[PDB]
Amino acid sequence: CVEEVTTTLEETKFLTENLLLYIDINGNLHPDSATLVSDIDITFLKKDAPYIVGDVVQEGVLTAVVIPTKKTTEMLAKALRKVPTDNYITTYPGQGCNGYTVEEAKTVLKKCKSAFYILPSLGTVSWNLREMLAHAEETRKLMPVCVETKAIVSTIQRKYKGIKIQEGVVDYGARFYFYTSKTTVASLINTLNDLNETLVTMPLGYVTHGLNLEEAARCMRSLKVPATVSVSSPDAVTAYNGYLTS
């Protein structure tokens, strides 16, 4: 019913051409699905938004289902039951920001309406901004920075006289990825995954995108690069790690 394959997307197409993607209420692709869509028009995903959980859109080789965020496992199962019975290449549903575990996803796919081929898929610290900047500078790790956070921008401008801060990668003094809250956490995670650099970072989405620390920890599971994650205090180190022990 569910088979974990050892192959890349292209190397799995011999089994089936059909891909099952996960989207949110607005038709935005989950980070795990966002990389499976190259050279395909995806206008249809957002064209009919907003959706409700369980809605399914299809075009060509692609099927996409709107999935929930865990509070429930029953709601994730109910959403997957709407996918037409077929054979699909996919990823485990509900990972990353949505908050489900791999075992929860397996439980849901165990119900076996369709057949699924599942593609294959650093210490936490409490460092202040001065410490993070110094660490980035010497290690050459990429440091995401929200440019709306003026206190950070001001610090960077004082440390690296002459830096011209703008959105995107800026490599001046240290290597920064400057972003704003006006793009999604998913898009930021996908960009950082594509850059394929080790990070030194605060939890992504925390505060800037309205996420609490647990929600941000869930999203951080979608990173496919190593990351030194720096949290607000020693007590937050324990909390954050606990969110990941789950």
Author numbering: 417 to 487, 491 to 540, 550 to 674
Lines from the paper:
In addition to the CoV-conserved domains of nsp3, SARS-CoV-2 nsp3 harbors a “SARS-Unique Domain” (SUD), which was first identified in the SARS-CoV genome. SUD-core does not possess enzymatic activity; rather, it functions as a binding module for viral and host molecules.
Therefore, we engineered a disulfide bond in SARS-CoV-2 SUD-core based on SARS-CoV SUD-core; the resulting mutant containing double mutations L516C-Y647C was denoted SARS-CoV-2 SUD-core-CC. The crystals of SARS-CoV-2 SUD-core-CC belonged to the space group of P321 and the best crystals diffracted the X rays to 1.35 Å resolution. Our highest-resolution dataset (1.35 Å resolution) was obtained by co-crystalizing SARS-CoV-2 SUD-core-CC with Comp.4, suggesting that it interacted with SUD during crystallization. However, the electron density of TF3 could not be located. SUD-core-CC comprises tandem SUD-N and SUD-M macrodomains connected by a flexible loop region. A nine-residue loop region between SUD-N and SUD-M (residues 541-549) is completely missing from the electron density map despite its atomic resolution, suggesting that this interdomain linkage is highly flexible. We superimposed SARS-CoV-2 SUD-core-CC and SARS-CoV SUD-core, and 257 Cα atoms aligned with a Dali Z-score of 24.1, and a root mean square deviation (RMSD) of 2.6 Å. This high structural deviation stemmed from distinct interdomain orientations between SUD-N and SUD-M in the two SUD structures, rather than differences in the individual domains themselves.
